[PDB]
UniProtKB/Swiss-Prot annotation:
CDD domains: fer2 (cd00207). Gene3D superfamilies: 3.10.20.30. Ferredoxins are iron-sulfur proteins that transfer electrons in a wide variety of metabolic reactions. Keywords: 2Fe-2S, Electron transport, Iron, Iron-sulfur, Metal-binding, Transport. GO terms for molecular function: 2 iron, 2 sulfur cluster binding; electron transfer activity; metal ion binding. [2Fe-2S] cluster binds at residues 41, 46, 49, 79. The gene is petF. Residues 3-95 form the 2Fe-2S ferredoxin-type domain. InterPro entries: 2Fe-2S_ferredoxin-like_sf (IPR036010), 2Fe-2S_ferredoxin-type (IPR001041), 2Fe2S_fd_BS (IPR006058), Beta-grasp_dom_sf (IPR012675), Fd_pln (IPR010241). Its cofactor is [2Fe-2S] cluster. This is Ferredoxin-1. Binds 1 [2Fe-2S] cluster. Forms a complex with heterodimeric ferredoxin-thioredoxin reductase (FTR) and thioredoxin. It comes from the Bacteria.
């Protein structure tokens, strides 16, 4: 499968659509399609690439930084997240975490 991922940057007022293989991380596909996004470790072990789901699902089992509550709230580490449906996700959400 190849899923539609809509990237929303709320502070900048942008909406960007990409197509993401079910076996590619969101961050890599965004970059390839011309949308650079924040990151640092690229390994699921920081908060730099955090996003927050609006709709749809991911498999971010490779992640380690987020706690279960944060995941429940919809936070995703985009560097290690595979889409498992069409997704709408807010980017640039690191500052929401504590
Ligand atoms: S860039 Fe560190 S968890 Fe994604």
């Amino acid at each position: 499968a190849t899923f539609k991922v809509t990237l929303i940057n709320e502070a900048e007022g942008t909406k960007h659509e990409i197509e993401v293989p079910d076996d590619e991380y969101i961050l890599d596909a965004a970059e390839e399609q011309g949308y650079d996004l924040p990151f640092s470790c690229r390994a699921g072990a920081c908060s730099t690439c955090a996003g927050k789901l609006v709709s749809g699902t991911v498999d971010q089992s490779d992640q380690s930084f987020l706690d279960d509550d944060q995941i429940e709230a919809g936070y995703v580490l985009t560097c290690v997240a595979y889409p498992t449906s069409d997704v709408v996700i807010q980017t640039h959400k690191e500052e929401d975490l504590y």
